[PDB]
């Protein structure tokens, strides 16, 4: 029962840390793509057109 509870807690922590890592990666990629990338675009437009 101790090992079964350990496996249950392992599965719970595994799914929790998996969703945490996934959320971190997509949120940071979203920061790159919707904040950093528009800044790249604005900087390039300012350099070229102006």
């Amino acid at each position: 029962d101790l090992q079964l509870k350990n496996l249950e807690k392992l599965s719970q922590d595994t799914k929790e840390e998996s969703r945490l890592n996934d959320t971190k990666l997509m949120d940071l990629q979203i920061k790159y793509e919707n904040e950093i990338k528009p800044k790249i675009d604005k900087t390039d437009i300012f350099i070229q057109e102006e």
Binding site: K24, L28, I36, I40, I47
Partner: protein
């Protein structure tokens, strides 16, 4: 590993914003200073003539 890899990616990206903005400002200032120096050189040459 993926998280840290594209974290290094975004860190390099932020360095790239900073470097690109600094380079653009520096080149604009350099062009303006070159124009002013050319103006000084040309008006001195005109006075000499």
């Amino acid at each position: 590993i993926e998280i840290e890899k594209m974290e290094k990616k975004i860190n390099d990206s932020n360095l790239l914003m900073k470097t690109k903005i600094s380079d653009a400002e520096e080149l604009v200032t350099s062009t303006e200073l070159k124009l002013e120096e050319l103006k000084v050189d040309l008006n001195r040459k005109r006075y000499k003539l």
